[PDB]
Amino acid sequence: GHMGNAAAAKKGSEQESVKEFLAKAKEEFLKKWESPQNTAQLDHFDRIKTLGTGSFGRVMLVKHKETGNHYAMKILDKQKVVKLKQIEHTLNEKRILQAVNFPFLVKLEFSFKDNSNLYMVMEYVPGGEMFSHLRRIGRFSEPHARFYAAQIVLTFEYLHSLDLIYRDLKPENLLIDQQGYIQVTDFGFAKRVKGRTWTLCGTPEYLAPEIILSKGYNKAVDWWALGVLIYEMAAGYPPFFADQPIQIYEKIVSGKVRFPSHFSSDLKDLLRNLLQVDLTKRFGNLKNGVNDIKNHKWFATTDWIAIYQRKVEAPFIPKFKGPGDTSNFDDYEEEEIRVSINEKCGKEFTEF
C-alpha cells in the first residue's frame, strides 16, 4: 500500500485519539452552550483606533481602563442590524463564541449592549489580517499556504464535530498572531446545524454551488470554501474571479476551474476534490470524512498533532512594536460612538 505497517498503525491510533479529543471537546462545549451575558460596560474601555469596518459597524482596538489590557471590540449598530437573518445571525455569533475553545479560534472576553449598540470584546491579535499580508506579498509558497490550511482543517474538524458550520471562510477573517499562527474571527455567519440549513449567505467568491442554487446545504460548504482559500493563498487570487457577483456565481456553478502553471500536481488534485460540485464526491463529505483531506499527498509533510500543539515553526512572524501596536492594520475613517437616550430594538435583542 502507500503506507507500511508502522506508518498505518500510527495513523490509525492517531485517528482514534482525535475521536477521544472531540468527545471531550463536545462535553465542554455543550455545558457552555446550554448556560451562556453582560460581563462589562462601554465606559470600562478607552477607544484607540478603528481596525476594520463593514456594513453594520466596526472593530476597534480598545484598552481596558482598569487592567491596561488591549482588546478588539466589535460594535454592531442595533438599528443597522435590521434584516431578519442579520438579527438571528448576531445571536448565533455571540452564543457560539462564548462556548467554543480551540487554539486557532479567537477568544471572547466580554459582551454587552446599550440603547444603540451590541458589543463583543475579544482578544486583540496584532499581527493583522491574512488578507493584507497576502495582497502585499502576492501569493504564498505552497509550504506556507499548507501551514495555514492545516490550521483551518483542524479548526473545521473541531467546529463540525460540534455541529457548527462556519460559512464565511476568507483571508479577511483570519488574523495572524504573534507566533505566526491563525486566529479565526468573525463568527457572524456561523450556525449550529444538525442536518441541512437554507439561508443564502456568505461572500460571493467563496460560496459553494449548492448555496448559489438555493439548495438545503450542510457542513460540506465549508470544505468547498477551504478549496477556494487554499487556491487564493497559493495563486494570489481566487478561482472564480469576476467584477459582479452574478458572473462569479455562473463560474462557480459551471464545474470548471483552471490552475496557475506553478501549482504542483498534488495541489491541483486536492483542489479538484475540494472544488467538487458533486456532493457525493467532495472531500470532507465522504465516508472517511476529514481524513480524506488529512491523508492527501499534499499534506504528507504535515504533522497534524504538532500543528495543533503549536510546535511547528511558522513561515512568517509579524512585526510587533509593543502592546497596542496597530502597524499591521490598514487605516479607516473614524466616527465617534453615539449612544441614544432611548433604547432601540430592546425586544429583538433580549437574548444578547
Binding site: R135, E172, T199, P204, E205
Partner: peptide, 13 residues
C-alpha cells in the same frame, strides 16, 4: 478582472 479589495459578506442574498 475581479475584486482585489476586501470583500463584504451578504447575510441574505
Amino acid at each position: 478582472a475581479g475584486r482585489t479589495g476586501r470583500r463584504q459578506a451578504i447575510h441574505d442574498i
